Amino acid sequence: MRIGHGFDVHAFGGEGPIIIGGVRIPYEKGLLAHSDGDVALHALTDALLGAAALGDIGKLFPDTDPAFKGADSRELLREAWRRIQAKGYTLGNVDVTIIAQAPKMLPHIPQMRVFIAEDLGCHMDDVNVKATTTEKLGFTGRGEGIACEAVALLIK
Amino acid sequence: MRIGHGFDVHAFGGEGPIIIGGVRIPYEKGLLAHSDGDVALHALTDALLGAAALGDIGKLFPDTDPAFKGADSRELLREAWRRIQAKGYTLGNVDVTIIAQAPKMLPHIPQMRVFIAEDLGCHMDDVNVKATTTEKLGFTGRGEGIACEAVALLIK
Amino acid sequence: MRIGHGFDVHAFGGEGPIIIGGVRIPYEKGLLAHSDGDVALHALTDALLGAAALGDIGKLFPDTDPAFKGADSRELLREAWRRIQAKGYTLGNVDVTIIAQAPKMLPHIPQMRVFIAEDLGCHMDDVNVKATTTEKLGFTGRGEGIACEAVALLIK
Numbered sequence: 465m466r467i468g469h470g471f472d473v474h475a476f477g478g479e480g481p482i483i484i485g486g487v488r489i490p491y492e493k494g495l496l497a498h499s500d501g502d503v504a505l506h507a508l509t510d511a512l513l514g515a516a517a518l519g520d521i522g523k524l525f526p527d528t529d530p531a532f533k534g535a536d537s538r539e540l541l542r543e544a545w546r547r548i549q550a551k552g553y554t555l556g557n558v559d560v561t562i563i564a565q566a567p568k569m570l571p572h573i574p575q576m577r578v579f580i581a582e583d584l585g586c587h588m589d590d591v592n593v594k595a596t597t598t599e600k601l602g603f604t605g606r607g608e609g610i611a612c613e614a615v616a617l618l619i620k
Numbered sequence: 621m622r623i624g625h626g627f628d629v630h631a632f633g634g635e636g637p638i639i640i641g642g643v644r645i646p647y648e649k650g651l652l653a654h655s656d657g658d659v660a661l662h663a664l665t666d667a668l669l670g671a672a673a674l675g676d677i678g679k680l681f682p683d684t685d686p687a688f689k690g691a692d693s694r695e696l697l698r699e700a701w702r703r704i705q706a707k708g709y710t711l712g713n714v715d716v717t718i719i720a721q722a723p724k725m726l727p728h729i730p731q732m733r734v735f736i737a738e739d740l741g742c743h744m745d746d747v748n749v750k751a752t753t754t755e756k757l758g759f760t761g762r763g764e765g766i767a768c769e770a771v772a773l774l775i776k
Numbered sequence: 777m778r779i780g781h782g783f784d785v786h787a788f789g790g791e792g793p794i795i796i797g798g799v800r801i802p803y804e805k806g807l808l809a810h811s812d813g814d815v816a817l818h819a820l821t822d823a824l825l826g827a828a829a830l831g832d833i834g835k836l837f838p839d840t841d842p843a844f845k846g847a848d849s850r851e852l853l854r855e856a857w858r859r860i861q862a863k864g865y866t867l868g869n870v871d872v873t874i875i876a877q878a879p880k881m882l883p884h885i886p887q888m889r890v891f892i893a894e895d896l897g898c899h900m901d902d903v904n905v906k907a908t909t910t911e912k913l914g915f916t917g918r919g920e921g922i923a924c925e926a927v928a929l930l931i932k
C-alpha cells in the first residue's frame with residue numbers, strides 16, 4: 465500500500481562512457497556527476513525511498529560523512545534498500561523510464577533489469593525499464609543531458 | 621499490485637489537426653510522428669505495458685514487421701491491452717496528464733475518456749485525464765511540442 | 777486501489793517570497809500565478825484528484841465562480857480533499873517531488889510535511905516530499921521557473 469516516485473537528470477560532459485541502470489554504455493560524451501551519474505538508479509532509489517517516506521537519496525548525503533560517497537549508484541541503491549526493508553517493507557514492483565535522445569537504451573535494458581533485480585533482491589518480472597526521446601526537443605532533445613523518471617510500489 | 625508509468629512527447633509541424641486521446645482537435649499546427657502522434661495514448665500504453673513488465677510500446681516496433689505499424693495509437697493500445705490481459709492482468713485505474721500550452725484540452729477530456737474506456741474495456745470511473753501548461757516555459761511553453769505523462773495500476 | 781499523478785509548473789517573476797508546500801521560503805525572485813503559485817500543493821491536489829477521477833484542480837476553476845479563487849493552494853487542497861472523502865475515499869500515501877535549481881528545499885521539507893499532513897488529515901508517515909535539480913538544464917536549470925511532480929495513492 466505504498467507508492468513512490470523519483471526524478472533525476474544529469475548533464476553531458478567529460479570523456480567517453482556513461483553508466484545507466486548499472487550498465488556501461490558507449491557514447492561520445494560522458495555524464496557529469498559527484499558519483500557515476502546513473503540517473504536511472506538515482507531515480508529508482510528516490511522512488512523506493514519515497515514510498516517508504518525516507519526522503520530522497522540526497523538524505524544519504526553529498527557531505528560524504530565517512531560512510532557514503534565514493535560509492536557508485538549501485539551501492540547506494542542496495543544501502544537504501546537495506547534501510548527500507550528495515551522498516552519491514554518488501555518490494556512489489558518498479559518501473560523506470562529513461563528519457564534520452566541518445567545513446568540507444570533498448571539493447572541494454574535486459575542487463576539493467578538483471579542488476580536492479582539483484583540489488584533489490586527479487587525477480588526480473590518485478591522490474592520494468594523503458595526509454596523514450598523528446599523528439600529533439602528540450603535539453604534532452606539536444607544532447608545536453610539525460611533525464612529519467614521512476615515509480616515504485618512497496619508492500620508491508 | 622502492479623504500478624506503471626509512461627512518458628511521451630511529439631514536436632509540432634505539418635498541416636492542421638492533432639489527435640489526442642483519440643480525439644481530433646483543431647489547431648494551427650500538427651504533430652510530427654511515424655503514426656498519429658497521440659502522445660496521450662502512447663504514454664498510457666507505456667504505463668499499462670510497464671506495469672505488466674512488457675517494456676514500452678516501442679517493443680511493438682517501428683520496424684513495421686507486417687503486423688503493427690500503419691495503425692493508429694488506438695489499435696496499438698487495444699493490442700497492448702490484449703497482451704496484458706493474456707498475462708492474466710485486469711485494469712484497476714489509470715490517470716493521464718497532458719502537458720501543452722495549447723490547444724485547450726479541457727473540453728475534449730470527456731470524449732478521450734470514452735475512447736480509453738472502450739479500448740481498455742472498463743468504466744470511465746477507472747480512467748482520469750487532465751491537462752496542464754508550463755506557463756510558457758520549456759519546449760512546451762513555446763509551441764514546440766506536446767508532452768504527456770501517465771500512471772497506471774493493474775490487478776491480478 | 778487508486779493511483780494518481782499530478783504535474784505543475786510556475787515561472788519566476790515578481791518581488792520576493794515564494795510559497796511551496798505551504799511554507800514561505802526566502803528567495804530573490806517570486807512566483808507568477810493567479811493565486812499563491814504553490815506548485816507543490818497544486819501537483820499534489822491534481823494527483824489526489826486524479827486518483828478519485830475528478831479531473832485536475834482546474835475543474836475547481838479560474839472562473840472565480842463566487843466560492844473558489846481568492847483562496848491559497850492550502851484551502852483548495854482541503855476542499856478537494858473534502859470532495860474526495862465524499863466519494864468514500866481515504867488517504868493511503870502521497871509522494872511529492874519538487875524540481876528547482878534554487879532555492880534549497882531540503883530544509884523546509886519537514887514543515888511542508890506538517891502542513892500536508894494537517895490538510896489531508898493523516899500522519900506524516902503517509903506523506904513524503906523530496907527535491908531535485910536539473911543540473912542547470914532546462915527552464916528549471918536556468919532560474920526561469922519551478923516544476924513539481926506528485927503521485928498519490930487512495931484507498932476505498
Ligand SMILES: Nc1ccn([C@@H]2O[C@H](COP(=O)(O)O)[C@@H](O)[C@H]2O)c(=O)n1
Pocket residue numbers: 520521522523875876877878879880881882883906907908909910911
Ligand atoms: N531546489 C532544490 C533541489 C535539490 N535539493 C536537495 O539537494 C540534494 C541533491 O539534489 P540534486 O539531485 O539535484 O543534485 C537532495 O537531497 C535535495 O533534497 C534541494 O534541497 N533543493
Ligand SMILES: Nc1ccn([C@@H]2O[C@H](COP(=O)(O)O)[C@@H](O)[C@H]2O)c(=O)n1
Pocket residue numbers: 563564565566567568569570571594595596597598599676677678679
Ligand atoms: N535513448 C533512447 C530513446 C528511445 N529508445 C527506444 O526507441 C523506441 C521509441 O522511442 P521514441 O518514443 O522516443 O521515439 C522505444 O522502443 C525505446 O525503447 C531507446 O532505445 N533509447
Ligand SMILES: Nc1ccn([C@@H]2O[C@H](COP(=O)(O)O)[C@@H](O)[C@H]2O)c(=O)n1
Pocket residue numbers: 719720721722723724725726727750751752753754755832833834835
Ligand atoms: N493544453 C491545456 C492546458 C491546460 N488546460 C486546462 O486549464 C486549467 C489550468 O491549466 P494550468 O495549470 O496550466 O494553468 C486546467 O483545468 C486544465 O485542464 C487545458 O484545457 N489545456
Ligand SMILES: C[C@@]1(CO)OP(=O)(O)OP(=O)(O)OC[C@H]1O
Pocket residue numbers: 472473497498499500501506521522525526533540
Ligand atoms: C551522491 C549523489 C550526490 O552527490 O550523486 P550525484 O552524482 O551528485 O547524483 P545526484 O543526482 O545528485 O543524486 C544524489 C546522489 O546520488
Ligand SMILES: C[C@@]1(CO)OP(=O)(O)OP(=O)(O)OC[C@H]1O
Pocket residue numbers: 628629653654655656657662677678681682689696
Ligand atoms: C509506432 C510509434 C513508433 O514509430 O509511433 P510513433 O509515432 O513514432 O510514436 P512514438 O512516440 O515514437 O511512440 C512509439 C510508437 O507509437
Ligand SMILES: C[C@@]1(CO)OP(=O)(O)OP(=O)(O)OC[C@H]1O
Pocket residue numbers: 784785809810811812813818833834837838845852
Ligand atoms: C487557481 C489556479 C488557477 O488560476 O491557480 P493557479 O495559480 O493559476 O495555479 P494553477 O497552476 O494554474 O493551478 C490551477 C489553480 O491552482
Ligand SMILES: [Mn+2]
Pocket residue numbers: 472473474501502503506507
Ligand atoms: Mn542523479
Ligand SMILES: [Mn+2]
Pocket residue numbers: 628629630657658659662663
Ligand atoms: Mn509518442
Ligand SMILES: [Mn+2]
Pocket residue numbers: 784785786813814815818819
Ligand atoms: Mn500551479
